[PDB]
């Protein structure tokens, strides 16, 4: 019989790759906060205590 | 100068919900509610109920 031969063989192309995934990490940056804590306290001064 | 700002959230009574808000589309200008085991009333703009 005429039996088959080896397959054609995959034609493989060498190369370099970079694989990118979806970015879920937040964009981070250094900020600076200027503010003023205003604390006003009302005290009742008793005879012995406050 | 601000010497204190008491900010609270009072519930809206049922009869003020069905009769006033859901029906007429308006809300009372005085908040009557129980807080810290006492019945308190807040009149908006230190004025009459509206």
What technique was this entry resolved by? Answer: cryo-EM
**Is residue B15 helix, strand or coil?**
helix
User: Would you state the structure tokens that stand for residue B40, as one six-digit string?
Assistant: 């308190």
Q: Is B19 helix (H, G, I), strand (E, B) or coil?
A: helix
Contacts of B41 (CB under 8 A, 6+ apart): B30, B31, B32
Half-sphere exposure of A40 (CA within 13 A, CB side): 5
Residues in B closer than 8 angstroms to A40, CB to CB, are: 1-4
Hey, what are A12's tokens? 């493989």
**For chains A and B, what is the number of CB pairs under 8 angstroms?**
6
Resolution reading in Å: 3.5
Smallest CA–CA distance, residue A36 to chain B, in Å, is 14
Query: Residues of B35-50 as b/e, b for ≥16 C-beta within 10 angstroms?
Result: eeeeeeeeeeeeeeee
């Amino acid at each position: 019989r005429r039996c088959p031969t080896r397959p054609e063989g995959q034609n493989y192309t060498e190369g370099i790759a970079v694989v990118f995934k979806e970015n879920i990490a937040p964009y981070k940056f250094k900020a600076t906060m200027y503010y003023k804590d205003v604390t006003v306290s009302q005290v009742w001064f008793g005879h012995r205590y406050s | 100068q601000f010497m204190g700002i008491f900010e609270d959230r009072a519930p809206v009574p049922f009869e003020e919900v069905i009769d006033k808000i859901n029906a007429k589309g308006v809300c009372r200008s005085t908040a009557k509610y129980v807080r810290n085991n006492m019945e308190t009333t807040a009149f908006h703009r230190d004025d009459h109920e509206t």
